[PDB]
């Protein structure tokens, strides 16, 4: 039960960030990159890389789209049901933190 529907007035542009979790140890950057790219142009595909220490590639990936639409169609296109290497991936919209700025936007 995770209901986080709150925050100041809604902004014209909605947070377009597809965070794929529960990723198999077999999945790699390129794997996800295309996996989503096929649906549309991806801003940037970020994935965890094995680093000196325990655990190589965690089960979480960040996927950014060019436009909200492509992100919506893709997010759902997969979210519905995505099986990779015998694993049901979990697509969720990365939760952002509410930060109120002080100075205006000159320009």
UniProtKB/Swiss-Prot annotation:
Tissues expressing this chain: Expressed in the crypts of Lieberkuhn of the intestine (at protein level).
Subcellular location: Nucleus, Nucleolus; Nucleus, Nucleoplasm; Cytoplasm; Chromosome
Domain RRM: 16-96
Effect of gene knockout: Arrests embryonic development prior to implantation. Embryos at 3.5 dpc lack the mature, tripartite nucleoli, but instead, contain spheres resembling nucleolar precursor body (NPB), indicating arrest of nucleologenesis.
Function: Plays a role in embryo pre-implantation development.
Family statement: Belongs to the RRM MRD1 family.
Protein name: Probable RNA-binding protein 19
Species of origin: Mus musculus
Parent-record interval covered: 816 to 909 of 952
